[PDB]
Design a protein around this ligand. Structure first.
Ligand SMILES: *[C@@H]1O[C@H](CO)[C@@H](O)[C@H](O)[C@H]1NC(C)=O
Ligand SMILES: *[C@@H]1O[C@H](CO)[C@@H](O)[C@H](O)[C@H]1NC(C)=O
Ligand SMILES: *[C@@H]1O[C@H](CO)[C@@H](O)[C@H](O)[C@H]1NC(C)=O
Lengths: 210, 206, 103
């Protein structure tokens, strides 16, 4: 019943301030740890902090004072705010829920992170943003920054059997990757097949017909 | 600050089998240990909490035991979807709840030279596609006219599909149109498993 | 070689704030009318059973150090006869743990 949905920047520059916002659908704040966890691109999970409906917070010291969370009673959302951003902060960021027991009644004071938001990729660098170029085959999106890029087919309908690959960093300082599909034999006409490609960081959505 | 230490790192071990994943708290953490599973295009989902209790939802084929300092998630009756990463989190000592660094759980060749548009812009890259490995360990070398390309080929690697088996590879050779307009044979040499290595030349037909 | 646990588990009859109201049979005196009684629980603290019935996450446990799971079976079943423990005998090959559900 609980939906977690986050959103925010995804690219920003050293010294600045990251800001992310999780909104909770189907339930409320009631004595849960509303948490923030991140994973550097090929790294370990790192616990950032958490807040409960009070305003009570607990941040990870090993981040000095940089991290700060807040909560917004009205809308059922809460929000991460990292200060003085630097390159290591490039990581996927998740909002998550942890239940905190019940004073007296409960065995423990923490049950898992049971509920996780979809994730927000946040890339810190000086480089500016460039939408990809889309070159049909199959589908090819090339030369974009930063991560990541959206690949859906026929406004979502077409789905099955794909191997949409991981991004490959080029020497040009710009990422690029390759999206395939597997539909053997033919039936070339009758059905028309389009790749939806979206690149939030740079306001680029191409519906390039293949 | 408790430090979590999983041990096997990787296990690409065969289905149906019994597997024992370890986790080791550097300190005594009673039974405050949870286990997370991480799928591909997915966030972590909660498997076992309280060192031993299955999270509401996750099937009984998962077994988390342990207490004090050495812990274990354990799976046996594997479904296909079970390839993923498996992380453990301690929650006795905090600030820093701390996680462990995890445990990680013949091909088919194709080839693809550029379209009209990729050329008309400036440079052109030729990519090949290794649909479905078993296993992923391989070397794929681009060559043009009894040569070998070094430094101008990039590599892409997928992680095992859940609703199937397998891996998948994506190499790419990056040069300018002042180099694709020329030259003859363009070979993607996929070694293992004797190799059929598709190609094309100079520009051709529809 | 290996260490075996045995959990002696009070069965719970129960039926969202995470609270569940539940009833179970407690002892003391060592042969009362076996007393049905009502306590409050945290829903995440009870695990289901094949019926709606529940057991707590952790229980009062005894540990043996057997030669084999077979010998440990005896030892526990003997230990249970010795103290007034009768119920469902289930066992896990991954926990190496015998759970008995009383009440
Ligand atoms: C004990 O619990 C049951 C079910 O919760 C209820 O029917 C009964 O009234 C309770 N007894 C008291 C004294 O509250
Ligand atoms: C115990 O649970 C059963 C169902 O399994 C129910 O019929 C019965 O009324 C319950 N008794 C009490 C005292 O709650
Ligand atoms: C134990 O409790 C069950 C239901 O929880 C009940 O059916 C049974 O009568 C109880 N045993 C006693 C009171 O000795």
């Amino acid at each position: 019943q609980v939906q977690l949905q986050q959103w925010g920047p995804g690219l920003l520059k050293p010294s600045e301030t990251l800001s992310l916002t999780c909104a909770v659908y189907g339930g409320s704040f009631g004595r849960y740890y509303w948490s923030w966890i991140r994973q550097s691109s090929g790294e370990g999970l790192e616990w950032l902090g958490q807040i409960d409906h009070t305003g009570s917070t607990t941040y990870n010291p090993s981040l000095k004072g940089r991290v700060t969370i807040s909560i917004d009673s009205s809308t059922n959302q809460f929000s991460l705010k990292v200060t003085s951003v630097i390159a290591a902060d490039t990581a996927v960021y998740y909002c998550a829920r942890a239940p905190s027991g019940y004073p007296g009644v409960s065995l423990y004071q923490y049950y898992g992170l049971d509920v996780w938001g979809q994730g927000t990729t946040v890339t810190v660098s000086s480089a500016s943003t460039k939408g990809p170029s889309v070159f049909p085959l199959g589908c090819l999106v090339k030369d974009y920054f930063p991560e990541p890029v959206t690949v859906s087919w026929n406004s979502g309908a077409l789905t099955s059997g794909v191997h949409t690959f991981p991004a490959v960093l080029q020497s040009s300082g710009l990422y690029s990757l390759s999206s395939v599909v597997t539909v053997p034999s033919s039936s070339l006409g009758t059905q028309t097949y389009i790749c939806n490609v979206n690149h939030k960081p740079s306001n680029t959505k191409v519906d390039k017909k293949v | 600050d408790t430090v979590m230490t999983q041990s096997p790192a990787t296990l690409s071990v065969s289905p149906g089998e019994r597997v024992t994943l370890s986790c080791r708290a550097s300190q005594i953490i009673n039974t405050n240990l949870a286990w997370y599973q991480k799928r591909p295009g997915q966030a972590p989902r909660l498997l076992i909490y309280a060192a031993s209790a299955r999270a509401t939802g996750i099937p009984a084929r998962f077994s988390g035991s342990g207490s004090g300092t050495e812990f274990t998630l354990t799976i046996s009756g594997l479904q296909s979807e079970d390839s993923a990463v498996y992380y453990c989190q301690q929650y006795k000592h905090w600030p820093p709840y701390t996680f462990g660094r995890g445990t990680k759980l013949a091909p088919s060749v194709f080839i693809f030279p550029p379209s009209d548009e990729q050329l008309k812009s400036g440079t052109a890259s030729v990519v090949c596609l290794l649909n479905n490995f078993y296993p992923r360990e391989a070397k794929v070398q681009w060559k043009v006219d009894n040569a070998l390309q070094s430094g101008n080929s990039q590599e892409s690697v997928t992680e095992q599909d859940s609703k199937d088996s397998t891996y998948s590879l994506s190499s790419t050779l990056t040069l300018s149109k002042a180099d694709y307009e020329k030259h003859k044979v363009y070979a993607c040499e996929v070694t293992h498993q004797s190799p059929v290595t598709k190609s094309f030349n100079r520009g051709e037909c529809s | 070689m290996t260490t075996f646990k045995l959990a002696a588990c009070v069965t719970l009859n129960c039926t969202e704030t995470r609270v569940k109201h539940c009833s179970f049979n407690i002892t003391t005196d060592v042969k009362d009318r076996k007393q049905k009684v009502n306590a409050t629980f945290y829903d995440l603290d009870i695990v289901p059973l094949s019926s709606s019935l529940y057991r707590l996450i952790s229980c009062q446990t005894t540990t043996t150090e057997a030669v084999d799971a077979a010998t440990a079976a005896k030892v526990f079943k003997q230990y249970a006869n010795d103290n007034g423990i009768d119920g469902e005998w289930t066992y896990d090959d991954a926990t190496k743990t015998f759970t008995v559900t009383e009440g």
